Amino acid sequence: IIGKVAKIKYIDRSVMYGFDEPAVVDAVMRPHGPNDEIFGLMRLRYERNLNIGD
Amino acid sequence: RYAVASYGPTDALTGQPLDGKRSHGGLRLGEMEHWVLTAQGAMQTIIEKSHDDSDGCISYICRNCGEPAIYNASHPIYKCMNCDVQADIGMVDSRRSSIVFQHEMRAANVNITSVLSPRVFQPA
Amino acid sequence: MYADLMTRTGQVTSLEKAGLNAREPSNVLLRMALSSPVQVLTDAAVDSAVNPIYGIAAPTLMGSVPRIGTMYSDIIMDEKYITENYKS
Amino acid sequence: MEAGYAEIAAVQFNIAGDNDHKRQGVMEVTISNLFEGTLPAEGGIYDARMGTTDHHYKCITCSHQRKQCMGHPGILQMHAPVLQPLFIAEIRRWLRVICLNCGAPIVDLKRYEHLIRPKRLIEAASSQTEGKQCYVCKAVHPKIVKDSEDYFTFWADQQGKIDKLYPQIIREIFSRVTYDTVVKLGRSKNSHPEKLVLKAIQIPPISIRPGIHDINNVIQYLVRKNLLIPKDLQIVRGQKIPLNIDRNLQTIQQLYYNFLLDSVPSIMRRLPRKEGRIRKSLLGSQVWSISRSTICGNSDLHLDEVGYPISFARTLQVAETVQHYNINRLMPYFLNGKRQYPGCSRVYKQITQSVHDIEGLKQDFRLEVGDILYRDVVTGDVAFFNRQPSLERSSIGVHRIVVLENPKISTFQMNVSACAWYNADFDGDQMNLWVPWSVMSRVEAELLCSVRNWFISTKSSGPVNGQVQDSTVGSFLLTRTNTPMGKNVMNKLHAMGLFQTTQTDPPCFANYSPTDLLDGKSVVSMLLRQTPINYQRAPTWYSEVYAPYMHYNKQDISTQIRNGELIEGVLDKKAVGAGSSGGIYHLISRRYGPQQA
Amino acid sequence: GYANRKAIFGLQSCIVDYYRRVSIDTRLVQQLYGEDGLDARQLETVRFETIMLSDQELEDKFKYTGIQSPLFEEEFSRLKKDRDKYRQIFLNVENFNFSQLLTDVRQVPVNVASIVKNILLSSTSGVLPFDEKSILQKYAMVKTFCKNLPYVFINNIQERLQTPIPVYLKRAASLMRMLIRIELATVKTLNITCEQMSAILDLIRLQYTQSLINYGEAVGILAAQSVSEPLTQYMLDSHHRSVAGGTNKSGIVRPQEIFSAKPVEAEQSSEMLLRLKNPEVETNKTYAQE
Amino acid sequence: MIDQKIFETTLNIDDPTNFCTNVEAHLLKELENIYVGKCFKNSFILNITGVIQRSPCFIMRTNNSGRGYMHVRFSAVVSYLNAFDLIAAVKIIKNDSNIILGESLLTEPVTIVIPSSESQNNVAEVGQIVPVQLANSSVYYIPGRQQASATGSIFIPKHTFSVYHVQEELTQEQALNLTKLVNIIEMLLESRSKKDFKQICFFEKLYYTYSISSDEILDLKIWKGPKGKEMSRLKPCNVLSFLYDALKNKNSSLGFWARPPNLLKSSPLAYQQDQNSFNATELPIICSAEVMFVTLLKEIINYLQFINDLCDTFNNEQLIKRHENIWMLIEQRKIGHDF
Amino acid sequence: GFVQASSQTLVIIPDNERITSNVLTTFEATRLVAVRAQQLAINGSTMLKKKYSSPIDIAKQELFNRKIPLLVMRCIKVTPEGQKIVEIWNPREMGIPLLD
Ligand SMILES: [Mg+2]
Ligand SMILES: [Zn+2]
Ligand SMILES: [Zn+2]
């Protein structure tokens, strides 16, 4: 969901979606942190009806 | 809900699965579960879960000095750094967290010596 | 089962670490698992304690499986039967 | 050269001295440097002879990869001797018993003969020994006082004259103690006090301290500040020493104490509590091949069945070893793979001794006798079912799996009468489930741990299961004599409809016209004829508390069953309820088995 | 959880060995598990008929007068001795308890009465004619069966060899010997043939073998689970129990006094039951109150 | 040497059902596949003679493999290599400045590494076959290795000898014990006697301490010794006949025994005197008859084996000339007849 | 010191002096079936007549039909003189518990 490579030629420091129920990417932004450095912010949404076990 | 696998991330120290769904690891068969399985007599289930599925391994102990030995079938190593010529190494079924536990006791200057079960022979 | 254990030594012992030390003093690994390993380990090293492997806690701390239930009895191969009924 | 099978029969504990460390150590730590480029520096605290923790390199000592190497200890030669943190108190006792100038004992050995061995030294040290005079060298034994500013320093107080018993001084004091003194004081020959001072310490194997951990910083500081102490340092009792040397000696000893007993990061802090080594790692375990979900009710499942979602059934696998007697049965699992249920995930090929995924499978691939097929979980497989806290021995039970083909169901489903085994209900309880894949564990699951083995309580010697809340009042209504609308009867069609769900062999209704009327006790008797028991007790329905204010039917207050025929009375908690000793299902168990009950 | 973990670590080393004893690696904790050698899942509550009867009702119901042989004088004499011994033991148990009343109901491995009832049900024959040869024979079979009953605890090899039986194994078969002599009495087995007696005796021995405890069973873990479980309901109460000084029975205070072997000085709810000496004083309440 | 040794081991059994169909045959095959030709328990195993004692096939209890295991007590032909022994056939493989590595041929596999000094690398060459002398306790039997790692020295015959003062009699049971060594020496002599005379003559000429010329060194049947001007007024005696007579108790064994280099090392002769008139450079050692007799008997066995290994190493004279540098090195280390 | 315990000799009690029961315990029968099923998963060589598609059913039928090639050893005592007194029982001649 987020591609991230560190240079040494590159090491793959990526983030994988590890959930058994699928999501939809709802909002992506790249805001500036307290140290004025970019970080990645992702929002994922799940359409949740009532189902057995709730 | 959670179901994982026969494999996944493990702890570098204990060799056991990581904790819970968040780490994508396993689930805990705790102290009380082993009480119930022991009360039922289900020892092959304990080997399957606590050894084959958690961190079971092979340990090598020299018969004559009771200390951990060094064995390697490939690249032949059959040695023991306590007698060095009388080595009589047997393989015992253990767990990595138990071997780590014994190394920690020796780090506190406590000598752990394992007396292996003696050989038994038919008469004559 | 409670009463016979608590009175097997001729005195009423407890289910605390003091009663365990009175009934099974040489079982260091069982006594370490209960309450306080460092204190029990320190006395075991000083006293040169020999710990036979029996019960549940001692085999478990050693990475083994208790000789209990399906592992109480040993199974051996029936040689006199296999030679007379099986082939290589 | 093969290592034969062995088991540990006993374990003996001893104090590790310096010869033990020099024999067991595989290398000597000499440099404080960590890494030479990417590989560990030879002679450092990460030397590969002590084991490997990366996948790049092997262990030099045993030539194994990271998974098969258990680590190997190293040696660090101390320039100045150090005291053992774990046995400081022991050292104190030895300083209160023997003479500091000659090593001969002060107390009377034969005085303490009547004590037991583990108490002779303690009791002889508890006595007053200050101011006494040795009978060999004629010396005055001072007061051995313990410094209050740390856990290791000892002072000698000779009538106000002050000395500091440095570890080398303590070593030379202890080295004059004979083995006879040790034996007469109760200790064994392996517990000579000379072992209590360390000149060479043991660097624990890297398997104990992966992440090359804040315990590595303690070892690194210890090695780095050990080099500062001159190698040719010697201490004599009464000698004056500089301040830099004294600061270095105390800091080295403080580091070693905090390496082992810091707040008891330290080695012994890993042991004690519920999150410690013994309880979290040894007495319990994180395991693989296990599932957890919220439990749910399902009245169509048998008591020894658990409803299992299909998604979990394609995650947990059963190990099948390919032989001549099961090659045909296992082939359809193999063909489906991961594209259709029931399929398989992996195959272990005994030729190359490796595991292959089923989607990365070769064109010319086939099952061979000796392969291990890991197939999906199907209906009829056995599984352990667990609810925590596991307080009784029915808290883990083996159920037959029914796989729920509906993809929108994520719950473990079971019959409400099975909840008594686990003290469970459906307000949000979660339960664990794992399917035995090993042949030995599968045999044990169905022969030892099946829930029919815990139908009778081990605690109370009575039945655990029965009717709960709906078949209790439902059994009363069915067997009740009169309905508010006359006699409690039903026609042939509605009597046949009671058996169309029981999943037993339907009874014969051929001797019945459509307008024939069957009462509830005749329908119940049609089911109890298979397991004919005898029963006669008053039902829960009849209470002397209610008798004055309500009219009891005389045919409802006397429940009698004769060879499976319900002659009269109603069925309720007394006869059919869960936990009812002497009830219908307790009697069926005693004559036909707990699986028949 | 605190009381459960301490009970299990103190008891888990108790394991059944090949003599049905409970030991800690060599050291006996029980000479026989549960003093009867049985599994708790293999018990049935069964009433013993002779306990409450008087000397005349006992002789009316169980003394057989059809045959004037000295065997039936001995058969009834053994019924009284079992009746008297049961009364003596459990009246004494009533003495050293607060409110533990005697009962004519025991948990036994085999329900002998129901076995006889089932075979009588399936018997093609009805009321058998008086056959004095078979009545004496069935008595010998039952007498021999009871004499050889403790061999259930050893094996059939020693039963064939008739080797001596340990005294503690004779005592473990006393309730089953007692029950069989009641439910297989001559007055109760007149409509049973000698072939049907062999079926009954074979069935009793089979069901008695199936109720024995297994070798290598962790029965100390079983006990700790069974005794710690009710403490949850004990703790769910204790706002229904006194908390005052001298009668504190809240929380798990009394259980902790027992399991920690606390001295009498540390007991917060100690009681005692004093029985008067004079029977005339016993009945009068003012005498008891004064 | 060769000897009989009893070992204990535990064998794993992956297929207990197939294994138990022919237990003795399968046990022999597994023991030969595992233990023959390796170093184990401070020894080296050649042959598995038999299985004295074994256990039933137990099933492994701490895992779910279904595999078996068996405790086996077996007897094996081992070859222990003592101190200061004489290996007379080694092939130098490597000759560096650090160490000189060679491997023995006629004996059971021993690799001999000489710590290279500044007087060795200029002599020894690859392919040359020389005799070596061993040292004390330096025959380390590293478990699981195919040979014996041992230090060695080029065997220049010494000029020294020892004197044992015997103060006890060699009784009947010890004589019976030494009868095995007597029989071993007899077998070595009968193996020596099957050859052509010249090779024994030439190798004994090389390895005799002094120089003796023109066919005066060997009487095979009677062993009368070298006929040089009767150096001693007493004839050297037979050890074999002395033991055979101590069996019948006709001789006493007290006094000072010695074997000066003037004697033939391989011959059963020795010097026994009633007075310490031996010209040695060390103090005579007081001992019993057992120590002295074991020492001299095993020395005779060692030297007979040494000469037989020299004989079996070289049969033609072309290899004799190809190694003539070692011949000259040994020749220069002799003494003339200036006595 | 001498860490290695001395070897033991296996003392088999004669069949007419055995004190343990002639009926297999449920633990022993379960262990026998599990061991034999694993052996069949290794080899597959059986003397059972009927065909079964799983090792477990072959093992149970072999136990029930008294054809199982295993023996039960009950370790009675370890004498401190070196003897290991055991009892050997043939499950083909033993009673079989209620495995249902
Ligand atoms: Mg709930
Ligand atoms: Zn060793
Ligand atoms: Zn390693």
Instruction: Give the DSSP letter string of B92-109.
Output: EEEEHHHHHHHHHHHHTT
d(CA B61, CA B87): 9
d(CA F215, CA F199): 13
Beta carbons of D218 and D258 less than 8 angstroms apart: yes
The experimental technique used to determine this model is cryo-EM
DSSP 8-state class, residue E32: S
d(CA D286, CA E73): 69
Beta carbons of D484 and D439 less than 8 angstroms apart: no
Q: B59 and chain C: CB distance < 8 Å anywhere?
A: yes
Tokens of D152: 């290791």
Beta carbons of E91 and E102 less than 8 angstroms apart: yes
d(CA F158, CA F137): 20
d(CA A40, CA A28): 8
Q: How far apart are the first and last CA of chain A?
A: 28
Interface probe for F, chosen from D5, D7, D437 (most Cβ of F below 10 Å), is: D5
Peptide bond into D342 cis (omega under 30): yes
d(CA C77, CA C88): 15
d(CA D454, CA D449): 8
Q: How many angstroms separate the alpha carbon of residue D426 from the centre of ligand 1? A: 6
d(CA F211, CA F334): 7
In 3D, which of A1, A48, A45 has the Cα closest to residue A26?
A: A45
Tokens of E277: 């000496």
Q: Which own/partner contact pairs does E261-264 have at CB distance under 8 Å and 24+ positions apart?
A: E261/C6, E261/C12, E261/C13, E261/C14, E261/C16, E261/C19
Beta carbons of E153 and G8 less than 8 angstroms apart: no
DSSP 8-state class, residue D280: I
Give Cα E232 distance to the centre of its chain.
28
- Neighbours of B, requiring at least 3 CB pairs below 8 Å, are A, C, D, E, F, G
Q: Which own/partner contact pairs does D325-328 have at CB distance under 8 Å and 24+ positions apart?
A: D325/G44, D325/G51, D325/G52, D325/G53, D325/G54, D325/G55, D325/G58, D326/G53, D326/G54, D327/D367, D327/D369, D328/G53
Q: CA of G96: which chain E residue's CA is closest?
A: E210
d(CA D46, CA D35): 8
d(CA D312, CA D289): 10
DSSP 8-state class, residue A52: B
Number of E/G CB contacts below 8 angstroms equals 38
DSSP 8-state class, residue C37: H
Beta carbons of E9 and E1 less than 8 angstroms apart: no
- DSSP β-bridge partners for residue D383: D399
Question: Which position has the token pair 């022993």?
Answer: G28
Please judge whether B35 and E214 are an interchain contact, meaning their C-beta atoms are less than 8 angstroms apart.
no
Please judge whether G43 and F17 are an interchain contact, meaning their C-beta atoms are less than 8 angstroms apart.
yes
Beta carbons of F146 and F79 less than 8 angstroms apart: no
- Using a 10 angstrom Cβ sphere, with 0-12 exposed, 13-18 middle and 19 or more buried, the burial of residue E164 is exposed
Pairing of strands G8-12, G83-89: parallel
Residues 38-77 of B with CB under 8 A from E: 38-39, 41
Provide φ and ψ at E116, rounded to 5°: -65, -40
Q: Which ligand number lies closest to the CA of residue B69?
A: 2
Residue by residue, DSSP assigns D78-106 as: EEEEEE-GGGHHHHHHHHTTB-TTT--B-
- Using a 10 angstrom Cβ sphere, with 0-12 exposed, 13-18 middle and 19 or more buried, the burial of residue F140 is middle
d(CA D290, CA B52): 13
Number of Cβ within 10 Å of residue D401's Cβ equals 22
- The C-alpha torsion from E255 through E257 and E259 to E264, rounded to 10°, is -150
Please judge whether F143 and B90 are an interchain contact, meaning their C-beta atoms are less than 8 angstroms apart.
no
- Using a 10 angstrom Cβ sphere, with 0-12 exposed, 13-18 middle and 19 or more buried, the burial of residue D336 is middle
In 3D, which of E213, E179, E160, E166 has the Cα closest to residue E33?
A: E213
Q: Which helix (H) or strand (E) holds E170?
A: helix E167-172
Q: How far apart are the first and last CA of chain C?
A: 51
Please judge whether C56 and B93 are an interchain contact, meaning their C-beta atoms are less than 8 angstroms apart.
no
Provide φ and ψ at F176, rounded to 5°: -65, -40
In 3D, which of G35, F143, G16, D7 has the Cα closest to residue B120?
A: D7
d(CA D317, CA D436): 9
d(CA D486, CA D480): 11
CB contacts of F10 in chain D (<8 Å) are: 4-6
Q: Is D289 helix (H, G, I), strand (E, B) or coil?
A: coil
* Of the partner residues G27, G76, G98, the one whose CB lies closest to the CB of residue E210: G98
- The C-alpha torsion from B13 through B15 and B16 to B19, rounded to 10°, is 40
Structural Rg of chain C based on CA atoms: 19
CB contacts of G39 in chain F (<8 Å) are: 16-17, 66
Please judge whether F10 and B122 are an interchain contact, meaning their C-beta atoms are less than 8 angstroms apart.
no
In our burial notation (b when 16+ CB lie closer than 10 A, e otherwise), range D80-93 reads: bbbbbbbbbebbeb
Question: Which position has the token pair 């101390």?
Answer: D78
Pairing of strands D143-146, D74-83: unpaired
Peptide bond into D389 cis (omega under 30): yes
Beta carbons of D239 and D165 less than 8 angstroms apart: no
**Three-state SS letters, D461-488:** CCECCCECCCHHHHHHHHHCCEECCEEC
Q: Which helix (H) or strand (E) holds F179?
A: helix F172-192
In our burial notation (b when 16+ CB lie closer than 10 A, e otherwise), range A19-54 reads: eeeeeeeeeeeeeeeeeeeeeeeeeeeeeeeeeebe
Interface probe for E, chosen from D282, D283, D391 (most Cβ of E below 10 Å), is: D391
Q: Which helix (H) or strand (E) holds E27?
A: strand E27-30
Please judge whether G10 and B44 are an interchain contact, meaning their C-beta atoms are less than 8 angstroms apart.
no
Packing angle between helix C37-47 and helix D117-126, nearest 10 degrees? Answer: 100
Question: Which position has the token pair 């910083």?
Answer: D217
Q: How far apart are the first and last CA of chain G?
A: 52
Q: CA of F14: which chain G residue's CA is closest?
A: G42
- Using a 10 angstrom Cβ sphere, with 0-12 exposed, 13-18 middle and 19 or more buried, the burial of residue F136 is exposed
Closest-CA distance of chain G to residue D5, Å: 15
Packing angle between helix D117-126 and helix D88-95, nearest 10 degrees? Answer: 60
DSSP 8-state class, residue E56: H
Tokens of B56: 């079971």
CB contact set of F152 (below 8 Å; sequence gap of 6+): F87, F90, F102, F112, F113, F114, F132, F133, F134, F135
Q: Which helix (H) or strand (E) holds D161?
A: strand D161-165
d(CA C79, CA F68): 13
d(CA D521, CA D561): 10
In 3D, which of D86, D586, F267, D579 has the Cα closest to residue C43?
A: D86
CB contact set of D443 (below 8 Å; sequence gap of 6+): B44, G30, G33, G34, G37, G56, G59
Helices and strands in chain F: count of H runs, count of E runs: 8, 15
Closest-CA distance of chain G to residue C69, Å: 6
B and C touch with 3+ CB pairs <8 Å, answer yes
d(CA G70, CA F204): 66
d(CA D358, CA D346): 5
Please judge whether B124 and F54 are an interchain contact, meaning their C-beta atoms are less than 8 angstroms apart.
no
Q: Which helix (H) or strand (E) holds E4?
A: helix E2-11
Q: Which ligand number lies closest to the CA of residue D387?
A: 1
Q: How many angstroms separate the alpha carbon of residue D597 from the centre of ligand 1? A: 27
Q: CA of D55: which chain B residue's CA is closest?
A: B12
CB contact set of F33 (below 8 Å; sequence gap of 6+): none
Tokens of G4: 């290695």
Q: CA of F35: which chain D residue's CA is closest?
A: D1
Q: Is D394 helix (H, G, I), strand (E, B) or coil?
A: coil
Annotated resolution, angstroms: 2.6
- Neighbours of C, requiring at least 3 CB pairs below 8 Å, are B, D, E, F, G
D and E touch with 3+ CB pairs <8 Å, answer yes
d(CA E224, CA D168): 52
Interface probe for E, chosen from D459, D460, D565 (most Cβ of E below 10 Å), is: D459
Half-sphere exposure of E110 (CA within 13 A, CB side): 28
Q: CA of D8: which chain F residue's CA is closest?
A: F62
d(CA E35, CA E20): 10
Q: Is D275 helix (H, G, I), strand (E, B) or coil?
A: coil
In 3D, which of F131, F133, F161 has the Cα closest to residue F261?
A: F161
In 3D, which of F69, F140, F75, D74 has the Cα closest to residue B86?
A: F140
In 3D, which of E205, E157, C87 has the Cα closest to residue G93?
A: E157
Provide φ and ψ at G82, rounded to 5°: 120, -15
Q: Is F131 helix (H, G, I), strand (E, B) or coil?
A: strand
Q: Which ligand number lies closest to the CA of residue B64?
A: 2
CB contacts of D408 in chain A (<8 Å) are: 51-52
CB contact set of D438 (below 8 Å; sequence gap of 6+): B44, B48, B52, D319, F64
Q: CA of A52: which chain D residue's CA is closest?
A: D409
Q: Which helix (H) or strand (E) holds D305?
A: strand D305-309
In 3D, which of G14, G28, C80, G63 has the Cα closest to residue E157?
A: G14
